[PDB]
Amino acid sequence: KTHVQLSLPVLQVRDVLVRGFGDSVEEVLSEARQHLKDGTCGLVEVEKGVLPQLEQPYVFIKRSDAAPHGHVMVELVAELEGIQYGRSGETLGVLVPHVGEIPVAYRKVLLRK
């Protein structure tokens, strides 16, 4: 399928144990997609002071359309030193590995895979 319904655990930035997916734009997008498929991907909602507490490159989910079955359609955009790889809509948050942190919420998304 070109899209997959996922419910992403929303993590507080200060709980996050593994603060990014790797060391290159291509690796973080690769690892993000693998973790999304494996159900091992969390979401941190972006506010003042969040991103400097996480590791670059960043992987964002961004709204790709204006929401089947409650699931917002999203796609991945990476960012490294102020350059984004991909073009999409509003940021829903930054993806991180999930290693058992307790979430505050779930974000239902339809991921363009």
Residues 6+ apart with CB under 8 A from 102: 15
The burial class, CB within 10 Å (0-12 / 13-18 / 19+), for 60 is: buried
Measured distance CA(59)–CA(79) in Å, rounded: 7
- Is-contact 44 10, C-beta < 8 A? yes
Report whether the peptide linkage leading into residue 57 is cis, meaning its omega lies within 30 degrees of zero: yes
Could you give the CA distance from residue 25 to residue 29 in angstroms, rounded to a whole number? Answer: 6
Give the CATH number of the domain where residue 12 resides. Answer: 2.30.30
Amino acid, single-letter form, for residue 48 = K
Report the number of distinct structural domains present in the chain. Answer: 1
Alpha-carbon distance of 80 to 83, in angstroms, equals: 5
Q: Is the dihedral of CA 107, 24, 52, 98 positive or negative?
A: positive
Looking at the DSSP bridge assignments, the partners of residue 60 are 77, 94
Instruction: Enumerate the β-bridge partners of residue 80.
Output: 83
| Helix/strand/coil for 111 | strand
Backbone dihedral region for residue 69 (phi beyond 0: left; psi -120 to 50: alpha; all else: beta): left
Give the resolution value in Å. Answer: 1.8
Residue 68, classified by CB atoms within 10 Å of its CB into exposed (0-12), middle (13-18) or buried (19+), is exposed
Domain that holds residue 21: 3-112
107: tokens are 């974000």
